[PDB]
Write a protein that binds this DNA or RNA. Sequence first.
DNA 1: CTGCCTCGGGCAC
DNA 2: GTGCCCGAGGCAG
Lengths: 209, 213
Amino acid sequence: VVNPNEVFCSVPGRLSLLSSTSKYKVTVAEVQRRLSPPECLNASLLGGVLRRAKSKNGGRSLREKLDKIGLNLPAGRRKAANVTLLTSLVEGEAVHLARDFGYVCETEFPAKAVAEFLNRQHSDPNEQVTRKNMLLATKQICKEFTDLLAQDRSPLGNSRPNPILEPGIQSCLTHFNLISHGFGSPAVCAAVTALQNYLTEALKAMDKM
Amino acid sequence: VVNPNEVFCSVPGRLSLLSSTSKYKVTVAEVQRRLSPPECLNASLLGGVLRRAKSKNGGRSLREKLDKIGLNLPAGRRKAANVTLLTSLVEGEAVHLARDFGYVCETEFPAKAVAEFLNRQHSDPNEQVTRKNMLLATKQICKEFTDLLAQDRSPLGNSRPNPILEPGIQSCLTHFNLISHGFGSPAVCAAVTALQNYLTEALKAMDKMYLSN
DNA sequence: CTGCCTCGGGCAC
DNA sequence: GTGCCCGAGGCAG
Ligand SMILES: NC(=[NH2+])NCCCO
Ligand SMILES: NC(=[NH2+])NCCCO
């Protein structure tokens, strides 16, 4: 449980069917990320992220709620320059969606059929050692890439872990965290799971011959 | 315009802020995909996908609407327990979410900073020829992998294109289309553009190492 | 874009 | 599994 003093509000997930998920907690720290660069969301956009009724002067109620817990959101703030579907997500549901994508990549992506099909496009007996080395090289480069993304210690929810990466690379990974509400790096890792399962199945199928 | 006779209903996007998207059209074809293997959604889950009010006899009216277009959904069909957050999506929003993921992987993923960091972890002179060849092999294998996914001709929306792949592999790709509502293969291609950009920037930072120092 | 008032869906049963 | 009624947000304007 997050300290209730740190909870700005609770928000029902956007992507749940038949009340599959409990509401997500949205912390002061999360709201502060949405209000700060690079997004600088305004009252109207943040009201949408928080799934709040569009009421007369709802802008004004949200801005007074923020003022009480120490965040200043001016009435005159323009709409953000770059909005995607990821901008709607609360950080809990963004992380949950990336884990779901990782789950479907691991359990539904046809890695073995893809391996058999692509191995079949290279049936010259004199290119098998080359293809095998290209596949091993791909598995190792992709592992180093996803090991770096897994060392991301960008703040999410009420967490602010000590960084393990140097500040330069951590500020760049934090930028990708902020525009994606935490979806980006874990979703990239989720997809590379489909690629790594293909590469595993391709090596396994070659090694049978 | 999609023939209105082929449109089951229109569904407001779940991930749109401040009315940024038109309602998505849901074709009869899309509904038939959700009701058929592998998902076999029941009336209650399909009602959530279509974002319909849980009204008195909502199940019955949905099943009557489905019989009028020739789709038989038995009232006793078991409730699928392997639903994910992707199961909530209409196909138009699933593809739009994959397109936006592709857009942030192309424009906001810090491929150059990641290239510089990972080149620095493997910066010994004695490994720079092997690293270059591993980076180049990674680019070629990844491009071949995304080229196969780009040849998927799974039905989506009102589209039923002629397959360009053999039926076996097309069948397997369609399975991943159906469980992800069209998100899966495009989202995997989106992420692999972030990896491809890292590989390009890693090769260019090695090429320009002298001028960089 | 604002915000009313329809109707989606969290919730209790 | 059903479906009320609060309140999110679709849509009118
Ligand atoms: N959650 C994730 N980023 N997924 C990667 C691993 C899939 O089991
Ligand atoms: N995924 C499923 N097959 N579940 C649905 C059960 C109803 O036949």
